[PDB]
Design a protein around this nucleic acid. Sequence first.
DNA 1: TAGGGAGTAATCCCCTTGGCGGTTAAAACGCGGGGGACAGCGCGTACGTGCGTTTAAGCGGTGCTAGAGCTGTCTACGACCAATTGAGCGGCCTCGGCACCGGGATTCTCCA
DNA 2: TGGAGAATCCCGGTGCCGAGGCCGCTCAATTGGTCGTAGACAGCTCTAGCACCGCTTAAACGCACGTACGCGCTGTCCCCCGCGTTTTAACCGCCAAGGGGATTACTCCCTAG
Lengths: 78, 77, 94, 97, 91, 93, 108, 106
Amino acid sequence: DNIQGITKPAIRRLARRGGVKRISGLIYEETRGVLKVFLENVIRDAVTYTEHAKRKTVTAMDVVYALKRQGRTLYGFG
Amino acid sequence: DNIQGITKPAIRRLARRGGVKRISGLIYEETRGVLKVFLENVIRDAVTYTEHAKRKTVTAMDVVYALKRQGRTLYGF
Amino acid sequence: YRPGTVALREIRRYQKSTELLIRKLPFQRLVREIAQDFKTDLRFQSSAVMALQEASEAYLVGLFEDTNLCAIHAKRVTIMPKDIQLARRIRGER
Amino acid sequence: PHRYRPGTVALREIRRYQKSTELLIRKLPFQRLVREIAQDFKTDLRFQSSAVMALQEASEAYLVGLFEDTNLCAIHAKRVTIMPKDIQLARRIRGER
Amino acid sequence: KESYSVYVYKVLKQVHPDTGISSKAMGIMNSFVNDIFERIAGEASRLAHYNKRSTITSREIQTAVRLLLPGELAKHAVSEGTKAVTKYTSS
Amino acid sequence: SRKESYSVYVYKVLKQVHPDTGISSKAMGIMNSFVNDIFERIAGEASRLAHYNKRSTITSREIQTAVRLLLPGELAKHAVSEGTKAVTKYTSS
Amino acid sequence: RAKAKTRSSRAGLQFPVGRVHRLLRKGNYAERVGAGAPVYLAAVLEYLTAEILELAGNAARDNKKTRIIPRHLQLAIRNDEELNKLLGKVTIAQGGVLPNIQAVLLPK
Amino acid sequence: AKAKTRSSRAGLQFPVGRVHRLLRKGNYAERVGAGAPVYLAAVLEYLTAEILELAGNAARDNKKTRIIPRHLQLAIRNDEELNKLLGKVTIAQGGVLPNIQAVLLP
DNA sequence: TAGGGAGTAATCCCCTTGGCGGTTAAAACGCGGGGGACAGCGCGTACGTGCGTTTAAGCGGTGCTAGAGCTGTCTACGACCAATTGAGCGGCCTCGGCACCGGGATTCTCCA
DNA sequence: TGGAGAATCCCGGTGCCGAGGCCGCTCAATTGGTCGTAGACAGCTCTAGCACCGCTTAAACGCACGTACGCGCTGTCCCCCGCGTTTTAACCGCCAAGGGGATTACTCCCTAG
């Protein structure tokens, strides 16, 4: 399963950081779905760069390129 | 004061196309503000390309480039 | 027609046509009024003003769609300044 | 006997987690999830330690930004409670939906 | 003043033989062609510079197409491109 | 191996603006990323400008225009100023 | 010299492999461009053109017209999940919108 | 004759030579003009200085001498012009601005 | 027709895969329990509808020249090329800023 | 106005790991010439943008009226919230193993000219 490793407490903390005072119990499973869709999109591109480079290991650069491709540029790696 | 030449009827029609059933009367002045901010952003870039090209005339391409620069690609020119 | 029906008829009329919804000369005068703040005595290709108009109307129409959903979420059928500002807020235009 | 009222400890937290830089999702659950997905695209991949951390940072940054927009939608509809409705309007106005 | 008009016309009269297309629509379609060209070429260039290559081979174009086009669109595009390159090689 | 970075120059500038302040390796990574990113942006827009106007040289004038398109507000004016100063010192020397 | 066989044909294509090659090479995508690259890119460009024009002609027939116009292109590009994802941030001049009225606004 | 770096000749800390190489070898253009790397180095130096200044202030306010990622986030988000330039950018270990919406307070 | 980028084999090391064992923070649970969501209801006002008058949108002409676009020259700047050297890369150095921990001093809640 | 006691902050000592730094050295950055064409410039044409003028009449705009929708107010009690609590497995620290990313060397056919 593994998606249920993104626990109800973990999602609570992220909502708190975003300024959320009260959280409906249905938010937790929606958040997991939304996260899974996002990760799939980034990993698909990261694997695509990995394959192109003839590598078997996904690198930090492959993830950074995948994120920049999708308009979510990440500073701190590369 | 040319902004009010964007008439209440014109704004109404655009809201109709956007699927709006009833319009609070404060919308008209917000819409003018929003439109003016958007036009300023596009025209500033279009003029920037125009100046670079050493032209005095803004061309259709300058506008298309300015729109593409802002993630609002315009097909047809 | 019973009240509110004529509005849905008008919406249908405006959603099936391809015509421009802002009058040409008012929009052209707005473009020139803005332009002279950036550089004086600018000339415009006729087609450049039409490109700006098509883009501008497309932007406003798309904004009104997002605005509409903000109103409906708040259990209203009327769009209000608040709805525009939230749409602009979440789009990241703010 | 003593009980802070509902809403009080929440604000304490909103102050705590807005002052800290830490990652809020535990790392191992996250690593497992990241891999669990990757093997559907290519079998027997390896991950740099830094690659998983980049994915985690981007994922947490995405979800927190989404929840800000979600919160504003709830407030617009005169609620304080976010729901599927709020999350979805947020995702739509943004463009994701 | 070069345009992909000619070719848009040949494709149209291949897929809907008695249908025409308007001048404005031709403009829009030509813009479409230019845009897709640009996007694919650019992603390909990036992939090249990232792998320290200095050449945009068939394999760059393929991976660009897989990054850019969604799902079935991507798959079918890859297919067509591969077919074309194969025929070219054969000739 | 060899992996060049802007860490040197970032540090030189830091010790001019705030001599008592240091910079962590993580913060240095972010600054290195930032310099790379905005280099790619300005060089990319200058490339497009050259191609558009059918020019084959990214001159100072392309970079100036790229800077005006990319940076918001006062950052544009200040960036254009320092650039103009730099090329003046260079060409006059 | 032997007779000039156009590469588009050598390829079985309507699109101009020749021009595509010029644009890739003269267009600074890289220092070197293979023959394969032009061929493949031209093919992909043809495929997407085909899809869009097909859906557009379908729309035109649905509205009993012989001539593909902008509104038709637009309604085509919006009724397909894949083309709408490819062109999701593109505006089409004289295209108009797709007809849509919310439920809560419909008569009750 | 003795070598004088184009950086020092231009009055810059940032490397005019390295920038020139990167403009040539990044396939941005067929030709790179002599003024281009000088201008670009000047701009990158300016923007570097601007962020580091605000980050140094942020570090000082937190009573620390080292810029950590948090300080870059606070520096970027509290300036409108940096926040518009870097609006779509995520900074590792940056955290978020302290911000509780008005209607949530007691 | 030229010549060098890349495909390939010999080689290896560093960082990723992987396991193991102990600790404890954290995650999840057995049971209570509530305040703000929501539904209902009433009321007033602002928006929709229509009706009449005013006002410039829009057509279409006339005219004029500004300025975009082309064309031919020529120079100065960049590519290249070879020699030279010093600034920057690896990695080793060493000492101080921060993390941490505890402990004490304080602000604050919320309800009596 | 007033407590219990919880969450919070500030001080101070410790020590560790990484912030700020130094030695070789090499390869890239500068110097100094050569050259040839890209682009700057000057001149010229004529396209289209600007400016203006008169007329028609579609629409805008101003007004009046009423109604239904927004909005305020009330009352009920859901399913999510919450505690101390119990359980669980990440985390941490350490260690073995060796995959495949990285280097060098060469050779040849790919694409440029």
